[PDB]
Subunit: 76 residues, 2 copies
Protein backbone atom coordinates (compact mmCIF):
# COMPACT_ATOMS: atom_id res chain seq x y z
CA UNK A 1 0.00 0.00 0.00
CA UNK A 2 2.95 2.36 0.66
CA UNK A 3 3.93 2.30 -3.03
CA UNK A 4 0.34 2.98 -4.14
CA UNK A 5 0.16 5.93 -1.72
CA UNK A 6 3.52 7.35 -2.79
CA UNK A 7 2.65 7.11 -6.47
CA UNK A 8 -0.61 8.97 -5.78
CA UNK A 9 1.22 11.64 -3.77
CA UNK A 10 3.56 12.24 -6.72
CA UNK A 11 0.68 12.25 -9.21
CA UNK A 12 -1.21 14.90 -7.21
CA UNK A 13 1.86 17.17 -7.31
CA UNK A 14 2.27 16.70 -11.06
CA UNK A 15 -1.41 17.42 -11.70
CA UNK A 16 -1.23 20.53 -9.49
CA UNK A 17 1.74 21.85 -11.52
CA UNK A 18 -0.16 21.22 -14.77
CA UNK A 19 -2.85 23.58 -13.44
CA UNK A 20 -0.81 26.54 -12.20
CA UNK A 21 -1.56 28.69 -15.29
CA UNK A 22 -5.34 28.31 -14.83
CA UNK A 23 -7.09 31.26 -13.19
CA UNK A 24 -9.34 29.91 -10.45
CA UNK A 25 -12.29 31.37 -8.56
CA UNK A 26 -12.10 31.70 -4.77
CA UNK A 27 -14.31 28.61 -4.44
CA UNK A 28 -12.07 26.62 -6.79
CA UNK A 29 -9.05 27.78 -4.78
CA UNK A 30 -10.83 26.48 -1.67
CA UNK A 31 -11.21 23.10 -3.40
CA UNK A 32 -7.46 23.08 -4.17
CA UNK A 33 -6.62 24.10 -0.57
CA UNK A 34 -8.81 21.25 0.70
CA UNK A 35 -6.95 18.81 -1.60
CA UNK A 36 -3.61 20.07 -0.24
CA UNK A 37 -4.86 19.60 3.32
CA UNK A 38 -5.88 16.01 2.62
CA UNK A 39 -2.55 15.40 0.85
CA UNK A 40 -0.80 16.57 4.00
CA UNK A 41 -3.02 14.28 6.10
CA UNK A 42 -2.15 11.41 3.74
CA UNK A 43 1.56 11.93 4.51
CA UNK A 44 0.86 12.12 8.27
CA UNK A 45 -1.02 8.81 8.22
CA UNK A 46 1.49 7.15 5.87
CA UNK A 47 4.42 7.95 8.14
CA UNK A 48 2.51 6.65 11.19
CA UNK A 49 1.82 3.37 9.34
CA UNK A 50 -1.96 3.86 8.96
CA UNK A 51 -2.04 3.00 5.27
CA UNK A 52 -5.81 2.65 4.91
CA UNK A 53 -6.49 6.15 6.22
CA UNK A 54 -3.53 7.52 4.27
CA UNK A 55 -4.77 6.03 1.00
CA UNK A 56 -8.30 7.35 1.60
CA UNK A 57 -6.89 10.84 2.15
CA UNK A 58 -4.85 10.98 -1.06
CA UNK A 59 -7.55 9.46 -3.25
CA UNK A 60 -10.05 11.96 -1.79
CA UNK A 61 -7.61 14.75 -2.72
CA UNK A 62 -7.43 13.35 -6.26
CA UNK A 63 -11.22 13.40 -6.52
CA UNK A 64 -11.30 17.06 -5.51
CA UNK A 65 -8.66 18.00 -8.07
CA UNK A 66 -9.96 15.78 -10.88
CA UNK A 67 -13.35 17.46 -10.71
CA UNK A 68 -11.59 20.77 -11.44
CA UNK A 69 -9.53 19.17 -14.20
CA UNK A 70 -12.75 17.94 -15.79
CA UNK A 71 -14.58 21.26 -15.44
CA UNK A 72 -11.63 23.06 -17.05
CA UNK A 73 -11.48 20.41 -19.81
CA UNK A 74 -7.90 19.41 -18.94
CA UNK A 75 -9.22 15.84 -18.83
CA UNK A 76 -12.28 14.07 -20.19
Amino acid sequence: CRERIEKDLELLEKNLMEMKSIKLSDDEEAVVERALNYRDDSVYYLEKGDHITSFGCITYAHGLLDSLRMLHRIIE
Copy 2:
Protein backbone atom coordinates in the same frame (compact mmCIF):
# COMPACT_ATOMS: atom_id res chain seq x y z
CA CYS B 1 -12.47 -1.23 7.04
CA ARG B 2 -15.81 -2.71 5.86
CA GLU B 3 -17.75 -0.43 8.22
CA ARG B 4 -15.81 2.65 7.08
CA ILE B 5 -16.51 1.74 3.44
CA GLU B 6 -20.21 1.09 4.04
CA LYS B 7 -20.66 4.36 5.92
CA ASP B 8 -19.01 6.21 3.01
CA LEU B 9 -21.22 4.40 0.49
CA GLU B 10 -24.31 5.54 2.40
CA LEU B 11 -22.99 9.09 2.76
CA LEU B 12 -22.39 9.38 -1.00
CA GLU B 13 -26.01 8.39 -1.67
CA LYS B 14 -27.32 10.93 0.85
CA ASN B 15 -25.16 13.70 -0.60
CA LEU B 16 -26.31 12.80 -4.13
CA MET B 17 -29.98 13.08 -3.07
CA GLU B 18 -29.28 16.48 -1.46
CA MET B 19 -28.13 17.66 -4.91
CA LYS B 20 -30.92 16.42 -7.18
CA SER B 21 -32.60 19.86 -7.43
CA ILE B 22 -29.39 21.52 -8.66
CA LYS B 23 -29.17 22.10 -12.41
CA LEU B 24 -25.79 20.85 -13.60
CA SER B 25 -23.76 21.48 -16.74
CA ASP B 26 -22.81 18.54 -18.97
CA ASP B 27 -19.29 18.63 -17.50
CA GLU B 28 -20.65 18.60 -13.94
CA GLU B 29 -22.90 15.69 -14.90
CA ALA B 30 -19.78 13.91 -16.17
CA VAL B 31 -18.17 14.47 -12.75
CA VAL B 32 -21.25 12.94 -11.06
CA GLU B 33 -21.25 9.99 -13.50
CA ARG B 34 -17.56 9.41 -12.72
CA ALA B 35 -18.36 9.42 -8.98
CA LEU B 36 -21.13 6.86 -9.56
CA ASN B 37 -18.73 4.67 -11.53
CA TYR B 38 -16.18 4.74 -8.72
CA ARG B 39 -18.94 4.05 -6.18
CA ASP B 40 -19.86 0.98 -8.18
CA ASP B 41 -16.19 -0.06 -8.29
CA SER B 42 -16.02 0.43 -4.51
CA VAL B 43 -18.85 -2.10 -4.08
CA TYR B 44 -17.16 -4.55 -6.48
CA TYR B 45 -13.90 -4.42 -4.53
CA LEU B 46 -15.64 -4.51 -1.14
CA GLU B 47 -17.55 -7.68 -1.99
CA LYS B 48 -14.35 -9.34 -3.27
CA GLY B 49 -12.60 -8.48 0.02
CA ASP B 50 -10.16 -5.92 -1.42
CA HIS B 51 -10.85 -3.27 1.21
CA ILE B 52 -7.92 -0.97 0.40
CA THR B 53 -8.94 -0.58 -3.25
CA SER B 54 -12.61 -0.34 -2.26
CA PHE B 55 -11.94 2.45 0.24
CA GLY B 56 -9.81 4.36 -2.29
CA CYS B 57 -12.66 4.16 -4.81
CA ILE B 58 -15.35 5.53 -2.51
CA THR B 59 -13.20 8.31 -1.06
CA TYR B 60 -12.23 9.32 -4.63
CA ALA B 61 -15.96 9.48 -5.46
CA HIS B 62 -16.50 11.70 -2.41
CA GLY B 63 -13.76 14.05 -3.59
CA LEU B 64 -15.41 14.39 -6.99
CA LEU B 65 -18.79 15.15 -5.45
CA ASP B 66 -17.51 17.40 -2.66
CA SER B 67 -15.85 19.67 -5.19
CA LEU B 68 -19.28 20.22 -6.76
CA ARG B 69 -20.87 20.72 -3.34
CA MET B 70 -18.28 23.40 -2.62
CA LEU B 71 -18.65 25.13 -5.99
CA HIS B 72 -22.43 25.25 -5.53
CA ARG B 73 -21.98 26.51 -1.94
CA ILE B 74 -23.82 23.53 -0.44
CA ILE B 75 -20.78 23.14 1.82
CA GLU B 76 -17.94 25.41 2.89
